[PDB]
From a paper:
Recently, the [name] (YAF9, ENL, [name], TAF14, SAS5) domains were identified as “readers” of lysine acylation, including acetylation and crotonylation. Unlike the bromodomains with end-closed binding cavities, the [name] domain adopts an end-open aromatic “sandwich” cage to recognize histone lysine acylation. The [name] [name] domain adopted an immunoglobin fold that consisted of a two-layer β sandwich between eight antiparallel β strands. The [name]/ENL [name] domains recognize acylated histones to recruit the super elongation complex and, in turn, DOT1L on active chromatin.
As the crystal structure also revealed that the methoxyl group of hit 2 pointed toward the unoccupied groove surrounded by residues F28, P60, and E75, we substituted the methyl group with a benzyl or phenyl group (compounds 10 and 11). Compound 10 achieved an approximately two-fold enhancement of the affinity for the [name] [name] domain. We hence solved the crystal structure of the [name] [name] domain in complex with compound 10 with clear electron density, diffracted at 1.8 Å. In general, compounds 2 and 10 demonstrated a conserved pose and thus shared a similar interaction pattern. However, compound 10 bound deeper along the same aromatic groove and thus had a more intimate cavity encapsulation than compound 2 did. Therefore, the benzyl substituent of compound 10 had additional interactions with residues P60 and F28 for enhanced affinity to [name] [name]. Sequence alignment of the [name]/ENL [name] domains suggested a conserved aromatic cage in [name] and ENL. It is, therefore, difficult to achieve a high selectivity between [name] and ENL [name] domains, as underscored by the similar affinity of compound 10 to both [name] and ENL (38 ± 6 μM) determined by CSPs, even though compound 10 represented a new chemotype with a binding mode distinct from that of SGC-iMLLT. Therefore, compound 10 was a dual inhibitor of [name]/ENL [name] domains. Compound 10 had weak potency in MCF7 cells using a Cell Counting Kit-8 (CCK-8) assay, but suppressed the proliferation of [name]-sensitive HGC-27 cells more effectively in a dose-dependent manner, which is consistent with the CRISPR result. Inhibitors harboring the new chemotypes were then uncovered guided by complex crystal structures, which revealed a binding mode to form an extra hydrogen bond in comparison with SGC-iMLLT.
Numbering used by the authors: 1 to 134
Amino acid sequence: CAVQVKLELGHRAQVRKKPTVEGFTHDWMVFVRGPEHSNIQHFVEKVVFHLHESFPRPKRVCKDPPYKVEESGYAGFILPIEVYFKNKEEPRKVRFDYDLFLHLEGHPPVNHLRCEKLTFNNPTEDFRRKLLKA
Ligand SMILES: O=C(COCc1ccccc1)Nc1ccc(Cl)cc1
Ligand SMILES: [Cl-]
């Protein structure tokens, strides 16, 4: 009995009115969530955001919702996101490579969204029950 669930990944980015002391020009926030009123905490163990190496503590871990990271910076980068599942079976996690892009000053703030389909073929009963609760 295969089960399909939905994950939304996205981010916002806005030019700061005043650069930070480091000269960072943008504030941004990247997130993983369920669509509409879906609570993905039923089947998500943790979300790991792998920031660019220039960031302090580049491995950011959210064990509880909201699964998000808020930061400031000066350039966009590819941000690997690992979503770990509440199971003890294959797969333990899934990985997405998120394009954390920023727009130049003058352009409207970034507000970006993509939606990811996860289909689990033959999950264990306990994991199937969690997936179906989201
Ligand atoms: O945007 C930033 C700012 O982050 C670094 C930081 C240093 C000290 C404190 C906070 C944050 N780095 C960055 C570098 C290369 C690429 Cl390709 C994309 C981004
Ligand atoms: Cl991807």
